[PDB]
């Protein structure tokens, strides 16, 4: 007949049950090639140890039931059909500590050889063990483990849509000028089993991010050297005046309230606190010198 | 939350039960052992937490 592609959509989806895994031979596993693009690091929580990022995610798999021949269908190659009208893999991330609000993509592309192309952006709230040892200049290494939460490796298996080097070097469509700088996203496949006879497919993504030591530069070193040179000015006061003692005390108070204010910036030892308590002790021995003379 | 006295945690939870209606023999089904079916297509227990 001649309703065109409307026939196709019917022909495929007439008796198509979206509950059963799309394989003619049930022994044949469905392989899902996935792709991850880092769009932005939204927020790092050092205290609660949790990373929040935004990812552009790609899912590719084969639906053996949605296959057809391009001919007698007016040479149609691919067809757009509703996501929730077809079988979809349950791949999730283990590091998930919450659920990020992400736009729902209603359509997917299914091609005549049964290739299903699923695009969707995800907001990932994933737990990550952070090490803030070198606070201003620290690198962070966070894992994103994509795996089917139920299906074994003989049912659902995960691969990479494109080369792992492409995935690694991909810094395109990513927002800089932020607190963090994306270094690389390193993909690695692993077969995880907690026992014999049951093995699952893992696809890890190591997102590595480096901090930008500029916002924390001025807010840290500038006031310290400021009160330092103010103290230096304070030495010029003659010991006889008596106002010199009040000088050192008031300055010590100011640096104290300063270190109490800057105490609420990043939790931990931060190690940079040592290079700070040095200044603290310097003002202390300065005061001790003043009261001595 | 010490003030409001409330704990927020994340748990990996496992449920195992017997569906007497979903039983079959592996043979004449091409020796299939288990089958993956949608959660909301079957009966599910209402187990929750009091706290």
């Amino acid at each position: 007949t001649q309703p065109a592609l409307l026939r196709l959509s019917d022909h495929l989806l007439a008796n198509y049950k979206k509950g059963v895994r799309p394989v003619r031979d049930w022994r044949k596993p469905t392989t899902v090639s996935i792709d991850v693009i880092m769009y932005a690091i939204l927020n790092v929580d050092e205290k609660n140890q949790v990373l929040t990022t935004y990812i552009w995610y790609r899912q590719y798999w084969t639906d053996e039931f949605l296959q057809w021949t391009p001919e007698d269908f007016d040479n149609v190659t691919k067809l757009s059909i509703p996501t929730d009208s077809i079988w979809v893999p349950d791949i999730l991330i283990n590091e998930f500590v919450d659920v990020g609000k992400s736009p729902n993509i209603p359509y997917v592309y299914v091609h005549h050889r049964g290739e299903v192309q699923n695009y969707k952006p995800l907001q990932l709230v994933t737990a990550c063990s952070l090490d803030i040892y070198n606070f201003p200049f620290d690198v962070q290494n966070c894992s994103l483990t994509f795996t089917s939460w139920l299906h074994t490796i003989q049912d659902i298996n995960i691969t990479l849509w494109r080369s792992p080097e492409e995935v690694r070097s991909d810094k395109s469509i990513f927002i800089n000028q932020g607190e963090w700088e994306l270094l690389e996203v390193f993909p690695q496949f692993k077969e995880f089993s907690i026992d014999i006879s049951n093995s699952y497919a893992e696809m890890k993504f190591y997102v590595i991010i480096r901090r930008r030591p500029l916002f924390y530069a001025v807010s840290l070193l500038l006031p310290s050297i400021f009160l330092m040179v103010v103290d230096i000015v304070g030495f010029c006061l003659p010991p006889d005046s008596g106002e010199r003692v009040s000088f050192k005390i008031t300055l010590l108070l100011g640096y104290s309230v300063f270190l109490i204010i800057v105490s609420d910036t990043l939790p931990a030892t931060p190690l940079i606190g040592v290079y700070f308590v040095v200044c603290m002790a310097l003002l202390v021995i300065s005061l001790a010198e003043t009261i001595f003379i | 939350d010490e003030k409001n006295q409330v704990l927020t945690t994340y748990i990996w939870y496992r449920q195992y039960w017997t569906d007497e209606f979903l039983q079959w023999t592996p043979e004449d089904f091409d020796n299939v052992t288990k089958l993956s079916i949608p959660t909301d297509s079957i009966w599910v227990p209402d187990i929750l937490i009091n706290e």
Partner: nanobody, 124 residues
Framework: DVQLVESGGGLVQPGGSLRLSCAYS????????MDWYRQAPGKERELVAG????????????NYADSVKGRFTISRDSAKNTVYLQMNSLKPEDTAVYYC?????????????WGQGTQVTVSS
């Protein structure tokens, strides 16, 4: 609940090779540990080889007896649902009935299961 079936046993000349297979089957089960046992006529049950996933949840960990230390190699295939025992350079002392012991967890609970075992006879 879970049934074990040994196979591959037969007659082989000394210095030869033979592969034993143990097929587990059932409904809902999880094999935590799989051991190979052999029992010579009159002699007790002897541990040959075992296998269990390591602390790291990826690669497995094998366990061999001092006797078959270098000759035997235990492996497994989760896809074929079968655990294998590769016997190389067979001695006449390797002649015995080989059973298999699976420590598995089912809906009933964690328990040990045994197969019927197969006869392995090494003679000239």
């Amino acid at each position: 609940d879970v049934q074990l079936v040994e196979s591959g046993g037969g007659l082989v000349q000394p210095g030869g090779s033979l592969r034993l297979s143990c097929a587990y089957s059932g409904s809902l089960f999880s094999i935590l540990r799989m051991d190979w046992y052999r029992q010579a006529p009159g002699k007790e049950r002897e541990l040959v080889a075992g296998i269990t996933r390591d602390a790291a949840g990826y690669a497995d960990s094998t366990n061999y007896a001092d006797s078959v230390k270098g000759r035997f190699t235990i492996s497994r295939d989760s896809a074929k649902n079968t655990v294998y025992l590769q016997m190389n350079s067979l001695k006449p002392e390797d002649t015995a009935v080989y059973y298999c012991n699976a420590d598995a967890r089912t809906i009933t609970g964690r328990a040990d299961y045994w197969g019927q075992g197969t006869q392995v006879t090494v003679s000239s």
